């Protein structure tokens, strides 16, 4: 029984353009624990991204938080791209600062 990953993209603190912050990609509810996730800056792989220690939920699905330090700036796109055996192609989720 494999489960597809859910994905939220968000900031540790309220986004203030010009204020340093943390970009988060929280991927949860996926079962086969092997998962590949990147955070992008205008469609381009950020290199200094880290992640929490792999854990799983009461329903056996795994979850992980990938994070990086950043500073947003109105004409700046940010996103999370995740690949997983359940996914036909890499699912990209764009970061909306109001969510």
């Amino acid at each position: 029984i494999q489960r597809t990953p859910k994905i939220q993209v968000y900031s540790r603190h309220p986004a203030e353009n010009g204020k340093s912050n943390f970009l988060n990609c929280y991927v949860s509810g996926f079962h086969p624990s092997d998962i590949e996730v990147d955070l992008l800056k205008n469609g381009e792989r950020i290199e200094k991204v880290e992640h929490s220690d792999l854990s799983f939920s009461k329903d056996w699905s795994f979850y992980l938080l990938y994070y990086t330090e950043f500073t947003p700036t109105e004409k700046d796109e940010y996103a999370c791209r995740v690949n997983h055996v359940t996914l036909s192609q890499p699912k990209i989720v764009k970061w909306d600062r109001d969510m």
């Binding site: 029984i1 939220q8 968000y10 540790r12 309220p14 943390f22 624990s33 220690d53 109001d98």
Partner: protein
């Protein structure tokens, strides 16, 4: 209130990508307090709470020894499971388990738990007797007869009814600083127009530590549901949490709706509205 202890166990075969990986994570009241890992190459990222280093290396190297013997058992488990399902040796599979005990305000054991999954699917579980088993399929039926013949439920029960609750009361006392932390959320309401006829109210809860929290929108003091959307609580990354809850109100009636926040860190539940 009522307390819980659980170990979450994970064992994964990696034919070729190195060799099996083993993880055991321990929880008191959903607070992670110990983490064992066959991949961890330094105990800095084999984390444990302060009141675990408090116990000395005569409770690390014992538990490290248990963990290491436990993985021999998990090694056979994975091989037997491959056989029960006639799986190939080149495939990766995942054995998981959750076990532990629930105690009441004093420590009256209330319930014991032990269950397993194979590749994400319930496999076998110890019923609430702690004396009998529920199998999921023929594989687990095989497991059940051998565990009936070896009298495993009795040993599981001894741990759950003994070691489990007696070590849990020790943890509850020794780590009560760390365990009942409880930082209250900071809350605000934002507004997002869609139609000329409509907007969306979003109620934000930020920086609360015990991940349990309840957000509720209500119209003239009446709880609402499906026109109300709820995002799943997410970690912020600083050992705190975020959540929000939205509702699509008809433009002009915004001051009808109020957001109710309930959380351990609050003297009393908060009520908020949109403030333009």
């Amino acid at each position: 209130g009522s307390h819980s202890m659980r170990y979450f166990d994970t064992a994964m075969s990696r034919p070729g990508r190195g060799e099996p990986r083993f993880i055991s994570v321990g929880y008191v009241d959903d607070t992670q307090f110990v983490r064992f890992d066959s991949d961890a190459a330094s105990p800095r990222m084999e984390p444990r709470a302060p009141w675990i280093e408090q116990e000395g290396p005569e409770y690390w190297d014992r538990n490290t020894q248990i963990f290491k013997t436990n993985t021999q058992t998990d090694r056979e488990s994975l091989r037997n499971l491959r056989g029960y399902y006639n799986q190939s040796e080149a495939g990766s599979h995942t054995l998981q388990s959750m076990y532990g005990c629930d105690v009441g305000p004093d420590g009256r054991l209330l319930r014991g738990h032990n269950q397993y999954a194979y590749d994400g699917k319930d496999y076998i579980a110890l019923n609430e007797d702690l004396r009998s088993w529920t199998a999921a399929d023929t594989a687990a039926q095989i497991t059940q007869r051998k565990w009936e013949a070896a009298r495993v439920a009795e040993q599981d029960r001894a741990y759950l009814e003994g070691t489990c609750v007696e070590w849990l009361r020790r943890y509850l006392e020794n780590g009560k600083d760390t365990l009942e932390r409880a930082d209250p959320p900071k809350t605000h309401v934002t507004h997002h127009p869609i139609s000329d006829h409509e907007a969306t109210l979003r109620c934000w809860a930020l920086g609360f530590y015990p991940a349990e929290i309840t957000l509720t929108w209500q119209r003239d003091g009446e709880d609402q549901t499906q026109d109300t959307e709820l995002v799943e609580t997410r970690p912020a990354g600083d050992r705190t949490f975020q959540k929000w809850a939205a509702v699509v109100v008809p433009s002009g009636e915004e001051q009808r709706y109020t957001c109710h926040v309930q959380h351990e860190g609050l003297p009393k539940p908060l009520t908020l509205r949109w403030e333009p």
